[PDB]
Enzyme design. Structure first.
Site, PDB file in Angstrom:
ATOM      1  N   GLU A   4       0.754  -1.216  -0.018  1.00  0.00           N
ATOM      2  CA  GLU A   4       0.022   0.025   0.114  1.00  0.00           C
ATOM      3  C   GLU A   4       0.681   1.281   0.008  1.00  0.00           C
ATOM      4  O   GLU A   4       0.481   2.447  -0.493  1.00  0.00           O
ATOM      5  CB  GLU A   4      -0.915  -0.003   1.261  1.00  0.00           C
ATOM      6  CG  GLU A   4      -2.114   0.937   0.938  1.00  0.00           C
ATOM      7  CD  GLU A   4      -3.366   0.164   1.193  1.00  0.00           C
ATOM      8  OE1 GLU A   4      -3.934   0.047   2.347  1.00  0.00           O
ATOM      9  OE2 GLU A   4      -4.117  -0.412   0.069  1.00  0.00           O
ATOM     10  N   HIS A  61      -3.865  -4.357   2.573  1.00  0.00           N
ATOM     11  CA  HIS A  61      -3.155  -4.183   3.785  1.00  0.00           C
ATOM     12  C   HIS A  61      -2.717  -5.671   4.502  1.00  0.00           C
ATOM     13  O   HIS A  61      -1.516  -5.964   4.788  1.00  0.00           O
ATOM     14  CB  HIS A  61      -4.170  -3.610   4.943  1.00  0.00           C
ATOM     15  CG  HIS A  61      -4.183  -2.325   5.354  1.00  0.00           C
ATOM     16  ND1 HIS A  61      -4.472  -1.277   4.658  1.00  0.00           N
ATOM     17  CD2 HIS A  61      -3.318  -1.969   6.670  1.00  0.00           C
ATOM     18  CE1 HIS A  61      -4.188   0.114   5.483  1.00  0.00           C
ATOM     19  NE2 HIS A  61      -3.738  -0.567   6.816  1.00  0.00           N
TER      20      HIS A  61
END
EC number: 6.5.1.4
Lengths: 335, 335
Positions: A10, A305
């Site tokens: 990310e 994530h």
């Protein structure tokens, strides 16, 4: 010595925090190289610095790069000492993130600890400090970890002023958490939290929830105006095998119906799969189960994530996670 | 009407483009709400505008938000018209991106088309326009899709001035692409592209490649100085069941061996797994196989882009992707 790439996954932030905890849990120092490469604010920011000062204090660390614009960090831990800690973030600082940096390390401290943090408890875009106590603290207790977080004062973004305090106890023995089917719903409850906001916003937000869900209780919770203007709405889904609770913090220019409609989106989204846990609780279970050396849970879809948390974890620990996306559900398991 | 969150997954950009192609493929309009929320440059940028202008020209669309700082966009496509288009991005513009936003739509156009785009052909940070012709066009052809990309002039970042043109033909019938084992190597070939750089950088670059690889051909490709100062090095891995090619664009302050070594890291990373395809080609195969309604391929690790591309595809189409991370290789399949 461990080297992590800040633009990986990310793109920094979480990478820094998962590294910190791991680096302390383990002792392995590390080096993040491109902190927030592309983010608006290029690297270390006040919150991260606070994440770092708290970390480089709970464990007498040696850091190289802890400056407000740094895109490079060298962190060499020491011994995670137990004790009464008090950190103070600003207003944009989420106690949640300091606490999820430092508490894991403290699980392995030489003794019990208390961490008190100050700042934002409820941020529009992010998870509220309640998730800790009402949602994961119990899965944790089951993995053998012992934490108790009390919300003592709320700080609603952008105000600041919140005070959250956690009691920890060094993990004795670890257990294997085995989640899967959410089981049958047992009860749903909506709750609105007003602080300096009128009882017509709560009612409106509640109604929307009652609009698509059969709530066993519709609760409105009032906090002193002192707690600044805030409104947070949550729906809990106490299923058989698990209890989840979703939140949506009311924004400045967002209507009672919009806020409530966001929450309803999520809730339905969770309910739309047999998965025991949500994308975010999933993200939090990766570390503790890794320390535990086994365990699994089902989650609808592997998130970006998840992917990065599982990377960092596996970068500091002798574990293998396996994601098997079978039939709209993803089985995250350890090895 | 489809709503998409721009801060989702990696965080906009690709979501925008995958949303356009799909929105035109399918017809379903949509709305991106936080285009590039956290990025340095917050929303729609010149390149994205071009992506959007090209899209809203191929299909006579209705757009709302198409402004240089926009974090919101509303797109109502029309009928994808075939024809000879010519788009012109800046210098920082990558023809590749415009082409991958438009071309998918054009597979469904009422007739054959040609798309000519100007701008950057070789950008240090991003994939060269050659990847399209020498690497994915063939997988595409196997899927039943018919596209032909000729690079006609190079534009090395930061110069600009490149010209890439692609011929397409509406997809008659689709095929199922079943990839998995890379198979045994069949040949490797290194290649250096010099445009206004000396023939000592090529050799040095090639050497390093020959340093860890057994190159069947060591080609040095010289471009008129006109093409500006540029250096791009690539290595092709023709295995049995697939041919891949990796590239590294020599940078301003990057030496021949550093350039070469980046390429060697990647080629090896690739080679280190049985996975037919690389992270990037995986990202590109998501869409076509989805239109194909089935197919699969193996990739070492599921990337974050893979995650988000799969999301958007699944948002516009009745398809289920399945990721099964088994034995260091992940199997991405459709349903």
């Amino acid at each position: 010595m461990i080297a992590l790439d800040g633009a990986q996954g990310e793109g920094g932030g979480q990478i820094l925090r998962s590294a910190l905890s791991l680096s302390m849990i383990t002792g392995q120092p590390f080096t993040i190289t491109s902190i927030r490469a592309g983010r608006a604010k290029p690297g270390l920011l006040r919150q991260h610095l606070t994440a770092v000062k708290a970390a480089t204090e709970i464990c007498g660390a040696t850091v190289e790069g802890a400056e407000l614009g740094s895109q490079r960090l060298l962190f060499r831990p020491g011994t995670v000492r137990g004790g009464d800690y008090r950190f103070a973030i600003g207003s944009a600082g989420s106690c949640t993130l300091v606490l999820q940096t430092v508490l894991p390390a403290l699980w392995f401290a030489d003794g019990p600890s208390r961490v008190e943090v100050s700042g934002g408890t409820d941020n529009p875009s992010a998870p509220p400090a309640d998730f800790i106590r009402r949602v994961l603290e119990p899965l944790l207790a089951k993995i053998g970890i012992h934490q108790q977080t009390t919300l003592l004062r709320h700080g609603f973004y952008p105000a600041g002023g919140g005070v959250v305090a956690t009691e920890v106890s060094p993990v004795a023995s670890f257990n294997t958490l085995q989640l899967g089917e959410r089981g049958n719903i047992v009860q749903m409850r909506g709750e609105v939290l007003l602080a300096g906001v009128p009882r017509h916003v709560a009612e409106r937000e509640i109604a929307t929830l009652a609009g698509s869900f059969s709530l066993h209780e519709q609760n409105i919770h009032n906090l002193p105006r002192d707690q600044g203007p805030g409104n947070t709405v949550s729906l809990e889904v106490e299923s058989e095998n698990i209890t989840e609770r979703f939140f949506v913090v009311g924004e400045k220019r967002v209507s009672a119906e919009v806020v409530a409609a966001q929450l309803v989106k999520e809730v339905k989204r969770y309910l739309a799969s047999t998965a025991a846990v949500g994308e975010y609780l999933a993200d939090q279970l990766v570390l503790p189960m890794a320390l535990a050396g086994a365990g699994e849970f089902t989650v609808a879809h592997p998130s970006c994530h998840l992917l990065t948390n599982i990377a960092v974890v596996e970068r500091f620990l002798p574990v293998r996670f396996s994601l098997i996306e079978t039939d709209g559900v993803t089985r995250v398991s350890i090895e």
